[PDB]
PDB file of all heavy atoms in Angstrom:
ATOM      1  N   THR D   7     -78.271 -40.677 -94.144  1.00 50.25           N
ATOM      2  CA  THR D   7     -77.915 -41.763 -93.230  1.00 50.25           C
ATOM      3  C   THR D   7     -79.053 -42.743 -92.981  1.00 50.25           C
ATOM      4  O   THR D   7     -78.794 -43.951 -92.937  1.00 50.25           O
ATOM      5  CB  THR D   7     -77.166 -41.304 -91.898  1.00 50.25           C
ATOM      6  OG1 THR D   7     -77.630 -42.045 -90.751  1.00 50.25           O
ATOM      7  CG2 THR D   7     -77.256 -39.821 -91.657  1.00 50.25           C
ATOM      8  N   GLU D   8     -80.288 -42.235 -92.855  1.00 49.54           N
ATOM      9  CA  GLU D   8     -81.498 -43.085 -92.763  1.00 49.54           C
ATOM     10  C   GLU D   8     -81.676 -43.901 -94.035  1.00 49.54           C
ATOM     11  O   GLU D   8     -81.958 -45.099 -93.994  1.00 49.54           O
ATOM     12  CB  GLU D   8     -82.764 -42.251 -92.503  1.00 49.54           C
ATOM     13  CG  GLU D   8     -82.904 -41.769 -91.054  1.00 49.54           C
ATOM     14  CD  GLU D   8     -84.199 -41.026 -90.750  1.00 49.54           C
ATOM     15  OE1 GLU D   8     -84.843 -40.456 -91.667  1.00 49.54           O
ATOM     16  OE2 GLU D   8     -84.574 -41.003 -89.555  1.00 49.54           O
ATOM     17  N   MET D   9     -81.490 -43.238 -95.173  1.00 49.68           N
ATOM     18  CA  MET D   9     -81.385 -43.934 -96.457  1.00 49.68           C
ATOM     19  C   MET D   9     -80.323 -45.074 -96.459  1.00 49.68           C
ATOM     20  O   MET D   9     -80.660 -46.210 -96.788  1.00 49.68           O
ATOM     21  CB  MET D   9     -81.207 -42.926 -97.587  1.00 49.68           C
ATOM     22  CG  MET D   9     -82.437 -41.988 -97.810  1.00 49.68           C
ATOM     23  SD  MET D   9     -84.102 -42.457 -97.119  1.00 49.68           S
ATOM     24  CE  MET D   9     -84.295 -41.327 -95.751  1.00 49.68           C
ATOM     25  N   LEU D  10     -79.086 -44.775 -96.036  1.00 51.64           N
ATOM     26  CA  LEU D  10     -78.009 -45.774 -95.785  1.00 51.64           C
ATOM     27  C   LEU D  10     -78.437 -46.924 -94.882  1.00 51.64           C
ATOM     28  O   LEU D  10     -78.259 -48.099 -95.205  1.00 51.64           O
ATOM     29  CB  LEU D  10     -76.833 -45.104 -95.067  1.00 51.64           C
ATOM     30  CG  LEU D  10     -75.329 -45.431 -95.177  1.00 51.64           C
ATOM     31  CD1 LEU D  10     -74.733 -45.388 -93.793  1.00 51.64           C
ATOM     32  CD2 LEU D  10     -74.982 -46.722 -95.864  1.00 51.64           C
ATOM     33  N   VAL D  11     -78.984 -46.565 -93.726  1.00 52.88           N
ATOM     34  CA  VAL D  11     -79.426 -47.534 -92.723  1.00 52.88           C
ATOM     35  C   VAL D  11     -80.495 -48.458 -93.284  1.00 52.88           C
ATOM     36  O   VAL D  11     -80.447 -49.654 -93.040  1.00 52.88           O
ATOM     37  CB  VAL D  11     -79.880 -46.814 -91.432  1.00 52.88           C
ATOM     38  CG1 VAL D  11     -80.679 -47.729 -90.549  1.00 52.88           C
ATOM     39  CG2 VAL D  11     -78.658 -46.256 -90.694  1.00 52.88           C
ATOM     40  N   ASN D  12     -81.442 -47.921 -94.048  1.00 55.79           N
ATOM     41  CA  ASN D  12     -82.407 -48.772 -94.762  1.00 55.79           C
ATOM     42  C   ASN D  12     -81.732 -49.830 -95.660  1.00 55.79           C
ATOM     43  O   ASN D  12     -82.088 -51.007 -95.596  1.00 55.79           O
ATOM     44  CB  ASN D  12     -83.438 -47.937 -95.528  1.00 55.79           C
ATOM     45  CG  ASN D  12     -84.346 -47.134 -94.589  1.00 55.79           C
ATOM     46  OD1 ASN D  12     -84.394 -47.395 -93.381  1.00 55.79           O
ATOM     47  ND2 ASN D  12     -85.057 -46.147 -95.138  1.00 55.79           N
ATOM     48  N   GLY D  13     -80.731 -49.414 -96.439  1.00 55.76           N
ATOM     49  CA  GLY D  13     -79.881 -50.334 -97.196  1.00 55.76           C
ATOM     50  C   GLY D  13     -79.243 -51.413 -96.342  1.00 55.76           C
ATOM     51  O   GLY D  13     -79.095 -52.556 -96.765  1.00 55.76           O
ATOM     52  N   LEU D  14     -78.879 -51.059 -95.120  1.00 56.54           N
ATOM     53  CA  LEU D  14     -78.104 -51.968 -94.280  1.00 56.54           C
ATOM     54  C   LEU D  14     -78.929 -52.962 -93.492  1.00 56.54           C
ATOM     55  O   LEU D  14     -78.390 -53.970 -93.082  1.00 56.54           O
ATOM     56  CB  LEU D  14     -77.159 -51.198 -93.357  1.00 56.54           C
ATOM     57  CG  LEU D  14     -75.986 -50.538 -94.072  1.00 56.54           C
ATOM     58  CD1 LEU D  14     -75.357 -49.498 -93.144  1.00 56.54           C
ATOM     59  CD2 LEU D  14     -74.928 -51.566 -94.599  1.00 56.54           C
ATOM     60  N   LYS D  15     -80.218 -52.698 -93.291  1.00 58.60           N
ATOM     61  CA  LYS D  15     -81.024 -53.556 -92.399  1.00 58.60           C
ATOM     62  C   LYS D  15     -81.129 -55.069 -92.737  1.00 58.60           C
ATOM     63  O   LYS D  15     -81.174 -55.888 -91.803  1.00 58.60           O
ATOM     64  CB  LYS D  15     -82.422 -52.969 -92.127  1.00 58.60           C
ATOM     65  CG  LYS D  15     -82.457 -51.763 -91.201  1.00 58.60           C
ATOM     66  CD  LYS D  15     -83.716 -50.955 -91.518  1.00 58.60           C
ATOM     67  CE  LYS D  15     -83.874 -49.743 -90.610  1.00 58.60           C
ATOM     68  NZ  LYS D  15     -84.761 -48.706 -91.231  1.00 58.60           N
ATOM     69  N   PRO D  16     -81.202 -55.447 -94.041  1.00 59.79           N
ATOM     70  CA  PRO D  16     -81.118 -56.879 -94.399  1.00 59.79           C
ATOM     71  C   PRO D  16     -79.771 -57.563 -94.108  1.00 59.79           C
ATOM     72  O   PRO D  16     -79.717 -58.794 -94.041  1.00 59.79           O
ATOM     73  CB  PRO D  16     -81.363 -56.889 -95.909  1.00 59.79           C
ATOM     74  CG  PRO D  16     -81.970 -55.558 -96.235  1.00 59.79           C
ATOM     75  CD  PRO D  16     -81.415 -54.600 -95.230  1.00 59.79           C
ATOM     76  N   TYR D  17     -78.699 -56.789 -93.945  1.00 58.20           N
ATOM     77  CA  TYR D  17     -77.383 -57.352 -93.604  1.00 58.20           C
ATOM     78  C   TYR D  17     -77.265 -57.603 -92.102  1.00 58.20           C
ATOM     79  O   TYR D  17     -76.234 -58.059 -91.602  1.00 58.20           O
ATOM     80  CB  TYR D  17     -76.262 -56.431 -94.088  1.00 58.20           C
ATOM     81  CG  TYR D  17     -76.124 -56.386 -95.605  1.00 58.20           C
ATOM     82  CD1 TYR D  17     -76.845 -55.458 -96.363  1.00 58.20           C
ATOM     83  CD2 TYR D  17     -75.286 -57.280 -96.279  1.00 58.20           C
ATOM     84  CE1 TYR D  17     -76.744 -55.426 -97.755  1.00 58.20           C
ATOM     85  CE2 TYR D  17     -75.170 -57.244 -97.681  1.00 58.20           C
ATOM     86  CZ  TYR D  17     -75.903 -56.320 -98.410  1.00 58.20           C
ATOM     87  OH  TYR D  17     -75.796 -56.268 -99.792  1.00 58.20           O
ATOM     88  N   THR D  18     -78.351 -57.320 -91.390  1.00 60.04           N
ATOM     89  CA  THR D  18     -78.384 -57.373 -89.945  1.00 60.04           C
ATOM     90  C   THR D  18     -78.922 -58.757 -89.570  1.00 60.04           C
ATOM     91  O   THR D  18     -78.597 -59.323 -88.511  1.00 60.04           O
ATOM     92  CB  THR D  18     -79.237 -56.178 -89.414  1.00 60.04           C
ATOM     93  OG1 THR D  18     -78.671 -55.659 -88.210  1.00 60.04           O
ATOM     94  CG2 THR D  18     -80.693 -56.527 -89.216  1.00 60.04           C
ATOM     95  N   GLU D  19     -79.710 -59.295 -90.506  1.00 59.83           N
ATOM     96  CA  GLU D  19     -80.333 -60.616 -90.433  1.00 59.83           C
ATOM     97  C   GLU D  19     -79.510 -61.673 -91.178  1.00 59.83           C
ATOM     98  O   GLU D  19     -79.155 -61.488 -92.354  1.00 59.83           O
ATOM     99  CB  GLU D  19     -81.744 -60.592 -91.071  1.00 59.83           C
ATOM    100  CG  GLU D  19     -82.594 -59.362 -90.788  1.00 59.83           C
ATOM    101  CD  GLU D  19     -83.244 -59.368 -89.397  1.00 59.83           C
ATOM    102  OE1 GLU D  19     -83.329 -60.456 -88.765  1.00 59.83           O
ATOM    103  OE2 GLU D  19     -83.676 -58.273 -88.941  1.00 59.83           O
ATOM    104  N   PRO D  20     -79.187 -62.776 -90.487  1.00 59.79           N
ATOM    105  CA  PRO D  20     -78.812 -64.025 -91.132  1.00 59.79           C
ATOM    106  C   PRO D  20     -79.940 -64.697 -91.934  1.00 59.79           C
ATOM    107  O   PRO D  20     -81.138 -64.563 -91.640  1.00 59.79           O
ATOM    108  CB  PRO D  20     -78.376 -64.906 -89.955  1.00 59.79           C
ATOM    109  CG  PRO D  20     -77.987 -63.937 -88.905  1.00 59.79           C
ATOM    110  CD  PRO D  20     -79.039 -62.878 -89.028  1.00 59.79           C
ATOM    111  N   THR D  21     -79.516 -65.418 -92.961  1.00 58.86           N
ATOM    112  CA  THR D  21     -80.413 -66.117 -93.859  1.00 58.86           C
ATOM    113  C   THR D  21     -80.367 -67.623 -93.564  1.00 58.86           C
ATOM    114  O   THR D  21     -79.330 -68.157 -93.172  1.00 58.86           O
ATOM    115  CB  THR D  21     -80.029 -65.784 -95.320  1.00 58.86           C
ATOM    116  OG1 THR D  21     -81.197 -65.436 -96.070  1.00 58.86           O
ATOM    117  CG2 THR D  21     -79.253 -66.909 -95.974  1.00 58.86           C
ATOM    118  N   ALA D  22     -81.512 -68.281 -93.731  1.00 58.30           N
ATOM    119  CA  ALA D  22     -81.655 -69.731 -93.562  1.00 58.30           C
ATOM    120  C   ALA D  22     -80.517 -70.555 -94.182  1.00 58.30           C
ATOM    121  O   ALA D  22     -79.841 -71.316 -93.484  1.00 58.30           O
ATOM    122  CB  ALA D  22     -83.024 -70.182 -94.090  1.00 58.30           C
ATOM    123  N   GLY D  23     -80.303 -70.390 -95.484  1.00 61.83           N
ATOM    124  CA  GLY D  23     -79.218 -71.076 -96.195  1.00 61.83           C
ATOM    125  C   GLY D  23     -79.638 -72.449 -96.674  1.00 61.83           C
ATOM    126  O   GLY D  23     -80.824 -72.722 -96.854  1.00 61.83           O
ATOM    127  N   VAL D  24     -78.652 -73.311 -96.886  1.00 64.83           N
ATOM    128  CA  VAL D  24     -78.867 -74.681 -97.368  1.00 64.83           C
ATOM    129  C   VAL D  24     -78.440 -75.661 -96.266  1.00 64.83           C
ATOM    130  O   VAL D  24     -77.329 -75.558 -95.760  1.00 64.83           O
ATOM    131  CB  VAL D  24     -78.028 -74.957 -98.645  1.00 64.83           C
ATOM    132  CG1 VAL D  24     -78.267 -76.377 -99.196  1.00 64.83           C
ATOM    133  CG2 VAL D  24     -78.295 -73.880 -99.722  1.00 64.83           C
ATOM    134  N   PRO D  25     -79.316 -76.615 -95.892  1.00 65.20           N
ATOM    135  CA  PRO D  25     -78.900 -77.622 -94.887  1.00 65.20           C
ATOM    136  C   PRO D  25     -77.656 -78.357 -95.373  1.00 65.20           C
ATOM    137  O   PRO D  25     -77.549 -78.640 -96.551  1.00 65.20           O
ATOM    138  CB  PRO D  25     -80.111 -78.558 -94.779  1.00 65.20           C
ATOM    139  CG  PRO D  25     -80.974 -78.251 -95.994  1.00 65.20           C
ATOM    140  CD  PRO D  25     -80.697 -76.833 -96.374  1.00 65.20           C
ATOM    141  N   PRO D  26     -76.691 -78.613 -94.484  1.00 66.60           N
ATOM    142  CA  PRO D  26     -75.320 -79.008 -94.889  1.00 66.60           C
ATOM    143  C   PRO D  26     -75.074 -80.296 -95.709  1.00 66.60           C
ATOM    144  O   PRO D  26     -74.026 -80.375 -96.362  1.00 66.60           O
ATOM    145  CB  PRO D  26     -74.564 -79.065 -93.553  1.00 66.60           C
ATOM    146  CG  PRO D  26     -75.384 -78.174 -92.618  1.00 66.60           C
ATOM    147  CD  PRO D  26     -76.798 -78.470 -93.020  1.00 66.60           C
ATOM    148  N   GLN D  27     -75.978 -81.281 -95.674  1.00 68.40           N
ATOM    149  CA  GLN D  27     -75.774 -82.516 -96.435  1.00 68.40           C
ATOM    150  C   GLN D  27     -76.150 -82.270 -97.886  1.00 68.40           C
ATOM    151  O   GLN D  27     -75.510 -82.785 -98.793  1.00 68.40           O
ATOM    152  CB  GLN D  27     -76.620 -83.691 -95.902  1.00 68.40           C
ATOM    153  CG  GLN D  27     -76.253 -84.264 -94.512  1.00 68.40           C
ATOM    154  CD  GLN D  27     -77.194 -85.405 -94.083  1.00 68.40           C
ATOM    155  OE1 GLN D  27     -77.598 -86.240 -94.906  1.00 68.40           O
ATOM    156  NE2 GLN D  27     -77.536 -85.451 -92.798  1.00 68.40           N
ATOM    157  N   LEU D  28     -77.211 -81.493 -98.080  1.00 68.17           N
ATOM    158  CA  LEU D  28     -77.656 -81.042 -99.390  1.00 68.17           C
ATOM    159  C   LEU D  28     -76.594 -80.177-100.069  1.00 68.17           C
ATOM    160  O   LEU D  28     -76.285 -80.369-101.238  1.00 68.17           O
ATOM    161  CB  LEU D  28     -78.916 -80.193 -99.226  1.00 68.17           C
ATOM    162  CG  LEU D  28     -80.034 -80.327-100.252  1.00 68.17           C
ATOM    163  CD1 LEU D  28     -80.841 -79.054-100.226  1.00 68.17           C
ATOM    164  CD2 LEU D  28     -79.553 -80.667-101.675  1.00 68.17           C
ATOM    165  N   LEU D  29     -76.074 -79.215 -99.306  1.00 68.94           N
ATOM    166  CA  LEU D  29     -75.022 -78.318 -99.724  1.00 68.94           C
ATOM    167  C   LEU D  29     -73.845 -79.075-100.308  1.00 68.94           C
ATOM    168  O   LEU D  29     -73.437 -78.797-101.429  1.00 68.94           O
ATOM    169  CB  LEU D  29     -74.581 -77.430 -98.550  1.00 68.94           C
ATOM    170  CG  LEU D  29     -73.689 -76.253 -98.953  1.00 68.94           C
ATOM    171  CD1 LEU D  29     -74.372 -75.375-100.015  1.00 68.94           C
ATOM    172  CD2 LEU D  29     -73.264 -75.411 -97.739  1.00 68.94           C
ATOM    173  N   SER D  30     -73.318 -80.040 -99.558  1.00 72.93           N
ATOM    174  CA  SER D  30     -72.191 -80.866-100.003  1.00 72.93           C
ATOM    175  C   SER D  30     -72.443 -81.519-101.353  1.00 72.93           C
ATOM    176  O   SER D  30     -71.555 -81.550-102.191  1.00 72.93           O
ATOM    177  CB  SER D  30     -71.908 -81.980 -98.994  1.00 72.93           C
ATOM    178  OG  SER D  30     -71.486 -81.446 -97.765  1.00 72.93           O
ATOM    179  N   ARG D  31     -73.650 -82.064-101.525  1.00 76.83           N
ATOM    180  CA  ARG D  31     -74.059 -82.728-102.762  1.00 76.83           C
ATOM    181  C   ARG D  31     -74.105 -81.734-103.924  1.00 76.83           C
ATOM    182  O   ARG D  31     -73.659 -82.046-105.021  1.00 76.83           O
ATOM    183  CB  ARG D  31     -75.421 -83.399-102.564  1.00 76.83           C
ATOM    184  CG  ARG D  31     -75.760 -84.455-103.596  1.00 76.83           C
ATOM    185  CD  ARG D  31     -77.186 -84.987-103.425  1.00 76.83           C
ATOM    186  NE  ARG D  31     -77.562 -85.699-104.631  1.00 76.83           N
ATOM    187  CZ  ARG D  31     -78.794 -86.099-104.934  1.00 76.83           C
ATOM    188  NH1 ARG D  31     -79.795 -85.864-104.089  1.00 76.83           N
ATOM    189  NH2 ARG D  31     -79.019 -86.752-106.085  1.00 76.83           N
ATOM    190  N   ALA D  32     -74.628 -80.538-103.647  1.00 77.85           N
ATOM    191  CA  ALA D  32     -74.691 -79.419-104.588  1.00 77.85           C
ATOM    192  C   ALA D  32     -73.315 -78.942-105.092  1.00 77.85           C
ATOM    193  O   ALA D  32     -73.106 -78.734-106.308  1.00 77.85           O
ATOM    194  CB  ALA D  32     -75.432 -78.259-103.944  1.00 77.85           C
ATOM    195  N   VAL D  33     -72.411 -78.740-104.132  1.00 76.73           N
ATOM    196  CA  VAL D  33     -71.067 -78.267-104.367  1.00 76.73           C
ATOM    197  C   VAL D  33     -70.354 -79.225-105.337  1.00 76.73           C
ATOM    198  O   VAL D  33     -69.701 -78.792-106.284  1.00 76.73           O
ATOM    199  CB  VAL D  33     -70.315 -78.094-102.991  1.00 76.73           C
ATOM    200  CG1 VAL D  33     -68.821 -78.273-103.119  1.00 76.73           C
ATOM    201  CG2 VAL D  33     -70.637 -76.763-102.362  1.00 76.73           C
ATOM    202  N   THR D  34     -70.530 -80.525-105.119  1.00 79.29           N
ATOM    203  CA  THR D  34     -69.898 -81.567-105.957  1.00 79.29           C
ATOM    204  C   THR D  34     -70.391 -81.562-107.418  1.00 79.29           C
ATOM    205  O   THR D  34     -69.602 -81.761-108.318  1.00 79.29           O
ATOM    206  CB  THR D  34     -69.955 -82.990-105.264  1.00 79.29           C
ATOM    207  OG1 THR D  34     -69.313 -83.985-106.087  1.00 79.29           O
ATOM    208  CG2 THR D  34     -71.374 -83.396-105.053  1.00 79.29           C
ATOM    209  N   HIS D  35     -71.681 -81.321-107.656  1.00 80.13           N
ATOM    210  CA  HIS D  35     -72.201 -81.103-109.024  1.00 80.13           C
ATOM    211  C   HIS D  35     -71.517 -79.876-109.659  1.00 80.13           C
ATOM    212  O   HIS D  35     -71.007 -79.942-110.786  1.00 80.13           O
ATOM    213  CB  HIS D  35     -73.742 -80.912-109.021  1.00 80.13           C
ATOM    214  CG  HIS D  35     -74.519 -82.186-109.118  1.00 80.13           C
ATOM    215  ND1 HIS D  35     -74.668 -83.056-108.055  1.00 80.13           N
ATOM    216  CD2 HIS D  35     -75.171 -82.756-110.161  1.00 80.13           C
ATOM    217  CE1 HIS D  35     -75.390 -84.096-108.437  1.00 80.13           C
ATOM    218  NE2 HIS D  35     -75.706 -83.938-109.710  1.00 80.13           N
ATOM    219  N   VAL D  36     -71.501 -78.766-108.916  1.00 82.11           N
ATOM    220  CA  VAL D  36     -70.879 -77.492-109.356  1.00 82.11           C
ATOM    221  C   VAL D  36     -69.396 -77.661-109.712  1.00 82.11           C
ATOM    222  O   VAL D  36     -68.974 -77.314-110.817  1.00 82.11           O
ATOM    223  CB  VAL D  36     -71.055 -76.377-108.279  1.00 82.11           C
ATOM    224  CG1 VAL D  36     -70.338 -75.090-108.676  1.00 82.11           C
ATOM    225  CG2 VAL D  36     -72.551 -76.117-108.025  1.00 82.11           C
ATOM    226  N   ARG D  37     -68.624 -78.217-108.772  1.00 84.55           N
ATOM    227  CA  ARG D  37     -67.176 -78.395-108.919  1.00 84.55           C
ATOM    228  C   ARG D  37     -66.866 -79.427-110.019  1.00 84.55           C
ATOM    229  O   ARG D  37     -66.039 -79.172-110.911  1.00 84.55           O
ATOM    230  CB  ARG D  37     -66.569 -78.807-107.581  1.00 84.55           C
ATOM    231  CG  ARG D  37     -65.047 -79.029-107.618  1.00 84.55           C
ATOM    232  CD  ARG D  37     -64.529 -79.623-106.317  1.00 84.55           C
ATOM    233  NE  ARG D  37     -64.684 -81.063-106.355  1.00 84.55           N
ATOM    234  CZ  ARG D  37     -65.610 -81.747-105.694  1.00 84.55           C
ATOM    235  NH1 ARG D  37     -66.459 -81.116-104.875  1.00 84.55           N
ATOM    236  NH2 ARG D  37     -65.670 -83.076-105.832  1.00 84.55           N
TER     237      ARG D  37
END
């Protein structure tokens, strides 16, 4: 379970991500 919990600890934190105007521009290249 401690082994499990170690696996889970990064899912406890949100990530910075991509600022939303940049994201939109990115998505349009992809799509």
Side-chain angles (χ1 to χ4, degrees):
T7 140
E8 283 184 336
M9 295 342 107
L10 212 222
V11 164
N12 294 345
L14 289 164
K15 287 155 178 158
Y17 291 89
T18 217
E19 320 282 342
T21 227
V24 182
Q27 291 179 39
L28 219 203
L29 192 56
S30 295
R31 198 186 165 192
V33 152
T34 181
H35 272 75
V36 176
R37 180 188 84 255

